[PDB]
Amino acid sequence: FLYDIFLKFCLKYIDGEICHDLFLLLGKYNILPYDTSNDSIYACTNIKHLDFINPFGVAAGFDKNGVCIDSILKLGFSFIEIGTITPRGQTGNAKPRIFRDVESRSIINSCGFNNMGCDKVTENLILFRKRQEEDKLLSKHIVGVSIGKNKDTVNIVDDLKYCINKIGRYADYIAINVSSPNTPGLRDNQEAGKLKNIILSVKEEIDNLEKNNFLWFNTTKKKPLVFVKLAPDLNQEQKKEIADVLLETNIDGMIISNTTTQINDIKSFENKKGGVSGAKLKDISTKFICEMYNYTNKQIPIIASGGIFSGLDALEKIEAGASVCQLYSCLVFNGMKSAVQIKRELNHLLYQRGYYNLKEAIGRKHS
Ligand SMILES: Cc1cc2nc3c(=O)[nH]c(=O)nc-3n(C[C@H](O)[C@H](O)[C@H](O)COP(=O)(O)O)c2cc1C
Ligand SMILES: Cc1nnc2c3ccccc3c(N3CCc4ccccc4C3)nn12
Ligand SMILES: O=C(O)c1cc(=O)[nH]c(=O)[nH]1
Q1: Which residue among 18, 258, 303 has the greatest number of ligand 1 atoms within 8 angstroms of its CB, and so is best to mutate?
Q2: 345 burial type by CB count under 10 A (0-12 exposed, 13-18 middle, 19+ buried)
Q3: What domains are there in the chain, each with its CATH number?
Q4: Is 214 annotated as a binding residue?
Q5: How far is CA 31 from CA 2, 18, 24, 85, in A?
Q6: Quick one: which residues bind FMN (predicted)?
Q7: 153-157: long-range contacts at Cβ-Cβ below 8 A with a sequence spacing of 24 or more?
Q8: 3-state class of 262 per DSSP?
């Protein structure tokens, strides 16, 4: 209630990234609210060995620098994708680079990987991983890392392999961000051939950490899984071309999806630069989940992202083929209550539809 009144005022009177930097500060000093519950095993999901306590996690770009991991996870989430991280720190693009429409529940952003750099973020994860040893309440909470490239870097691979060698020992999973619209020429890395080299080189570098170098100082105590974040602005030819790469390279998951450049039906996001996230992306990401779940013949697990605000929105994703649901615009528009309400909303529906558990619902639309 206290943070909900304050968030409403924030959305209508204070700048989007000031708000964002303000709440993250109230997180680093552990004064954000808490969601206490062991979470019903009813909603338990998994991607290989990654055991999620609940199907809801916080998507990348929220805790870019991993300075707020404990307080964000303590809001009722099972996992956090920290990043996107780049080898060297970046100030990103010119501000204001975050805008929101309340009536249509959407966000437009041209951040351009604003982060402290892989080395500083690694130290921030080391400190959370050290806390995770003493604090038992965060021992089953997964932390993923989204790895990217610096603006001026011509060879994406060198940057991705750099990131692995520093933060790889502390990640439960590594997300390859090849879908940023604010990093010039990055979506060109989603092309079948390039992505095949990317995934393989990234997987070789994770494998090499184990070959060359207690070691896995993460939740799993195992080597990080590899996920790729895909852009919704692709043709059917590319989406199927990618599927063959993901099936052959054996990617451990695929995050569907990132922000869109296609949504131009928002009047307040007209001449603002960046990708649109929120309630407008909802249907676009679900159909991309659907397409990819059948282009990859149900083999590659899916991490849903794009317009998830409710239990019905969450079930829509799970049934399309999603194993986990990633949040972002829900935390922005609905506030701190997001994961409490959405777990509750979903559990009501899982019972109402008659599923014994969540794992029974994954891809049941295609049944
Ligand atoms: C301000 C902002 C920054 C973002 N930065 C990143 C990022 O660094 N890496 C990433 O993979 N996604 C990033 N995203 C995309 C989110 O992870 C998410 O996929 C997107 O917001 C769509 O989900 P939503 O509709 O639930 O918000 C960003 C989104 C916003 C609004
Ligand atoms: C209000 C508001 N107007 N714009 C934004 C915004 C923009 C980008 C990312 C997050 C947020 C955000 N959240 C609100 C929820 C939350 C929870 C934990 C840690 C930080 C935050 C910040 N609140 N917010
Ligand atoms: O850092 C950004 O600007 C960014 C990255 C990403 O993957 N998606 C997004 O919309 N913004």
Answers
A1: 258
A2: middle
A3: 1-367 (3.20.20.70)
A4: no
A5: 12, 17, 10, 26
A6: 60, 64, 84, 229, 278, 307, 328-329
A7: 153/87, 156/186, 156/189, 156/198, 157/197, 157/198, 157/201, 157/202
A8: coil
